């Protein structure tokens, strides 16, 4: 049994470490987004100046 | 004690496929944002060619 426990702890936090990597990965692509949007934004409002004119 | 750590991995165990499905759906949801963003600026490069002419 301790063995048993073994094995499972490993599966158990191989599954943890993977999904550290993955959410990292996932949180780089949220900061990414916004600053996607961050410059369309910028670019709606001169695109908006420019229709006023 | 150990019967107790087995009620413990059993459902840490339950937890962490869970985690992995909570974090597969988000994935699609950034997919989603990715696509969203595209389709933005899919309509504002079409508004400043309408904006040239």
Same mark, same amino acid.
């Given at each position: 049994?301790?063995? &048993? %426990? +073994?094995?499972? %702890? *490993? ?5 943890? /470490? !993977? $999904?550290? +990597? /993955?959410?990292?990965?996932? +949180?780089? &692509?949220?900061?990414? $987004? ?5 410059? %369309? @934004? @910028?670019?709606? +409002? ?5 229709? *006023? !004119?």
């Amino acid at each position: 049994q301790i063995s &048993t %426990l +073994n094995s499972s %702890l *490993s599966s158990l936090s191989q599954r943890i /470490t !993977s $999904l550290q +990597n /993955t959410l990292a990965s996932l +949180n780089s &692509t949220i900061s990414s $987004l916004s600053g996607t949007a961050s410059s %369309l @934004s @910028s670019q709606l +409002n001169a695109l908006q100046g420019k229709i *006023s !004119s």
